[PDB]
Ligand binder design. Structure first.
Ligand SMILES: Cc1ncc(COP(=O)(O)O)c(C/N=C(\C=C/OCCN)C(=O)O)c1O
Ligand SMILES: Cc1ncc(COP(=O)(O)O)c(C/N=C(\C=C\OCCN)C(=O)O)c1O
Lengths: 394, 394
């Protein structure tokens, strides 16, 4: 089919959390502005998805629904074909979303007072999942060298020596810095984890969005023993812009860990009964592979436009290329504005809506995260508006 | 439009928890057998809903979605028009399901050791919400006379005196006895609650399926002060057969109680982002009223066919008419079979799949719950099959 990645769309007054946030922040925002914040695409969904769901509505009843064996096989085939990862269909545990699955993980495998290690700066909900449940947030700050982030293995090893720490909440690819971890880096983290009593919770929700030139590696696929104590969070929501269909595939090899995760899930959120949620995942995996490839190309072209934009108009600001996700990390520190004032500047002067770096942790202070999943023309419009705003700032 | 309540459908191999459960229990079930357990309908979804959903799919983007103002107004209108209940839009808190919402009520407003009063026999998850979270189940057993259920007010008031009991978890209409509470009964319960420090958790998810001859009263609409400490669980799921669209509307008047519920919901399941869930509820509410009325007539017609069937065929078994829901409570006590062996009989001999009464509490042992939401033809087929099994049992 013909794929549209050029049509500027409008989600105004449609229930989009992203757009509604924008208007709430700047009621006077211009009608031509597009928000570049929340992680969902400003592209229509795969045509095959839409046709498939419509066709499905005429063949099924919208009552209590669970995953069929075909659905499970389909999920399993996607992991082999796309990630050289062999999973068992009975390793699949469904939740309405990854975040709830992470909260459920904290709740079941740790208690109040226990420590949970997160590598910061990172997707803020990681923090909430931990602190909002009386658990201790143990930060292993990423090392930032000239804009490239790497893991402080020394600190990580030290942290794993504290018995009060019960798990490593890992993000791969890493939102917001866009790091796609190398096998070497993963192997090092592995020895440390295998030497400690830490469980591995690996949020790999962005694993299908890898920029040309790089390759994602499912963390638990590199070692049997590691897998034995790893919970990998995955979904097709980010990959195919369906965070609104409410379906996730939590991969858990260890039968005990898996049953414990389930019993904890059933006493909190329960099993997802969504009928179209399962179906949307199955269709995307079976029929939307080409759409994803086209989408990745556009995303790659966008990160390069953003990078060239700053090199041409405001060199002291840097927007380096990323390895994964469609969220680019932009260093605005040379602008010398305190994050609150910068945010103010961005929202009301440039009417450009990023995900202010500071919300991912203090290490994100001075940075901005731009959502690259939009037509290249929308990105150019936004940047040109920022160009005028930064020039006026002088 | 034309409404179909006559086509015998099949939910085999489509992920239905009901049908799949049937083959799980009796792998040798007939291919002509329709299960009558789980509370979802064996009727095709309202046409308006289907056409609406397909149309919306060509228009929207399936990303992070929340409720629109139009969405809220619609829920408020349904509450006024259908239940003479005056509610404000900000009283509306959404959750994926009513059970998770109930689990959330226990979790936030009580603590391990505390007691929660439930009027048994009743929907099994109620017991789970409590005991699975280290809370105590305080049973206020129903009074049963000739098959008519009433509240043991004497025991209720007594229980409301034990300050260790934090709240009454009310089911109205009451699954599985079909009771639709009378204004005067609610009045008595209201007084016990207002005279004590009990919170009121009224699950009224079945309040739209009222049988010809009765009127349901929204518990918190009878007294302002009761509403001040009441959480009402509502949903369009049972009404329009969309338990698979996952969208609940928990109504909470008091701002503080509401905020606690929300923060609690966000520490477990989180906000529902399911875009279609919001749209389905809106459409059914705005367009499927005629469908609902037609649907209740068939259900009422079926309950009477069941009641007559036993009178004419096996008088010692009683299936008295119900006032609400489409789940009829049948008394097989005269059969002198212990629930376990009786269940075995139904499943394998009559191949009729009920919701064995004993799962709703000891007071259910000897009873069977039949799902009347199916074409009258399928109900007849089901009865005739049992008819033979009973005669064979002699
Ligand atoms: C009083 C009551 N509350 C809540 C619910 C469920 O609400 P939800 O969580 O879907 O929003 C039901 C239906 N419960 C049944 C349905 C099945 O539950 C198991 C589904 N696989 C039944 O057979 O009685 C009910 O009778
Ligand atoms: C590492 C990571 N995990 C999980 C999720 C969300 O998973 P869910 O619970 O939907 O399955 C995201 C996207 N998080 C973003 C957006 C979410 O907004 C949610 C509220 N609208 C973002 O802008 O980085 C993410 O980056």
């Amino acid at each position: 089919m013909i794929y549209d990645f050029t049509t500027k769309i409008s989600r105004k007054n449609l229930g989009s959390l992203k757009w509604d946030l924008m208007y709430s922040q700047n009621p006077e925002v211009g009608n031509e502005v597009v928000p570049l914040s929340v992680a969902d695409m400003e592209f229509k969904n795969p045509p095959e998805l839409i046709e498939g769901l419509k066709k499905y509505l005429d063949e099924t009843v919208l009552g209590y629904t669970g995953p069929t064996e075909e659905y499970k096989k389909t999920v399993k085939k996607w992991m082999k074909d796309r990630h050289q990862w062999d999973i068992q269909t009975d390793w699949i545990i469904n939740t309405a979303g990854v975040v709830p699955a992470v909260f459920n993980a904290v709740r079941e495998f740790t208690k109040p007072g226990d420590g949970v290690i997160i590598i910061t700066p990172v997707y803020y909900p990681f923090f909430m999942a931990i602190k909002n449940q009386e658990r201790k947030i143990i930060e292993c700050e990423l090392l930032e060298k000239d804009g490239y982030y790497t893991i402080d293995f020394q600190k990580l090893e030290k942290l794993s020596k504290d018995k009060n720490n019960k798990a490593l909440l890992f993000c791969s690819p890493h939102n917001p810095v866009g790091r796609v971890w190398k096998k070497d880096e993963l192997q090092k983290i592995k020895d440390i984890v295998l030497k400690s009593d830490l469980m591995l919770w690996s949020d790999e929700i962005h694993f299908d969005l890898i920029m040309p030139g790089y390759e994602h590696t499912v963390f638990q696929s590199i070692d049997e023993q590691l897998a034995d104590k790893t919970i990998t969070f995955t979904a097709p929501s980010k990959t195919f812009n369906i965070a609104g269909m409410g379906m996730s595939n939590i991969i858990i090899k260890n039968p005990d860990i898996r049953e414990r995760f389930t019993k904890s899930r059933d006493a909190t959120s329960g099993m997802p009964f969504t009928t179209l949620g399962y179906k949307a995942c199955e269709i995307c995996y079976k029929e939307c592979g080409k759409w994803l490839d086209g989408c990745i190309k556009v995303i790659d072209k966008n990160q390069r436009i953003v990078k060239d934009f700053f090199e041409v108009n405001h060199p002291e600001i840097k927007a380096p290329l990323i390895e994964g996700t469609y969220l680019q990390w932009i260093d605005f520190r040379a602008l010398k504005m305190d994050h609150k004032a910068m945010e103010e500047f961005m929202i009301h002067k440039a009417q450009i809506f990023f995900d202010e770096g500071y919300i991912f942790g203090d290490g994100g202070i001075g940075f901005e995260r731009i959502n690259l999943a939009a037509p290249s023309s929308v990105i150019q419009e936004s940047l040109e508006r920022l160009n005028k705003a930064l020039k006026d700032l002088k």
